[PDB]
From Swiss-Prot, chain A:
One of its GO terms (cellular component) is mitochondrial inner membrane. The keyword Ubl conjugation does not apply. It comes from Saccharomyces cerevisiae (strain ATCC 204508 / S288c) (Baker's yeast). The gene is ATP17. Coiled coil: none annotated. The chain holds residues 7 to 91 of 101 of the full protein. This is ATP synthase subunit f, mitochondrial. GO terms for biological process: proton motive force-driven ATP synthesis; proton transmembrane transport. F-type ATPases have 2 components, CF(1) - the catalytic core - and CF(0) - the membrane proton channel. In yeast, the dimeric form of ATP synthase consists of 17 polypeptides: alpha, beta, gamma, delta, epsilon, 4 (B), 5 (OSCP), 6 (A), 8, 9 (C), d, E (Tim11), f, g, h, i/j and k. Belongs to the ATPase F chain family.
Curated annotation (Swiss-Prot), chain B:
This is ATP synthase subunit 4, mitochondrial. Mitochondrial membrane ATP synthase (F(1)F(0) ATP synthase or Complex V) produces ATP from ADP in the presence of a proton gradient across the membrane which is generated by electron transport complexes of the respiratory chain. F-type ATPases consist of two structural domains, F(1) - containing the extramembraneous catalytic core, and F(0) - containing the membrane proton channel, linked together by a central stalk and a peripheral stalk. During catalysis, ATP synthesis in the catalytic domain of F(1) is coupled via a rotary mechanism of the central stalk subunits to proton translocation. It is found in: Mitochondrion; Mitochondrion inner membrane. The modification Phosphoserine is found at S4. It comes from Saccharomyces cerevisiae (strain ATCC 204508 / S288c) (Baker's yeast). F-type ATPases have 2 components, CF(1) - the catalytic core - and CF(0) - the membrane proton channel. In yeast, the dimeric form of ATP synthase consists of 17 polypeptides: alpha, beta, gamma, delta, epsilon, 4 (B), 5 (OSCP), 6 (A), 8, 9 (C), d, E (Tim11), f, g, h, i/j and k. Present with 12900 molecules/cell in log phase SD medium. Belongs to the eukaryotic ATPase B chain family.
């Protein structure tokens, strides 16, 4: 009966659809992400932290300090042998 | 989603012309309607003088 008008009804359409929820998720997801590996805190020491940073990161990740811990029990219990028997 | 929104870049600037020129080309023909009145009148006049 007249010139009907759905070319411009986008302004209040852009809430209900599914990429709108993904869009408002990931524009929030992107800003607080640190850019290029920044603030990783690669240097730390608390009298036991260099042990962790040298041994217990994902780079080395070897169980040989447990060996040393086992050696520590060889340092401990055998000396407890010297304290008991 | 960037591509889907960028499909709607220059729609409004062109559809504000579409709306207006479309309804004008609909509704600027009542002149032709009132011309049709005169056309059918002269049609009847030619028909009856053909009868005479």
């Amino acid at each position: 009966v007249s010139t009907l008008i759905p070319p411009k009804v986008v302004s209040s359409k852009n809430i209900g659809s599914a990429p709108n929820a993904k869009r408002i998720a990931n524009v929030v997801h992107f800003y607080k992400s640190l850019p290029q590996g920044p603030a990783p805190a690669i240097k730390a020491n608390t009298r036991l932290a260099r042990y962790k940073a040298k041994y217990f990161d994902g780079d080395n990740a070897s169980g040989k300090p447990l060996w040393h811990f086992a050696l520590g029990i060889i340092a401990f219990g055998y000396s407890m042998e010297y304290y008991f028997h | 989603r960037i591509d889907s929104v960028s499909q709607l870049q220059n729609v409004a600037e062109t559809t504000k012309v579409l709306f207006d020129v479309s309804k004008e080309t609909v509704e600027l023909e009542s002149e032709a309607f009132e011309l049709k009145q005169k056309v059918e009148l002269a049609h009847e006049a030619k028909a009856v003088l053909d009868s005479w």
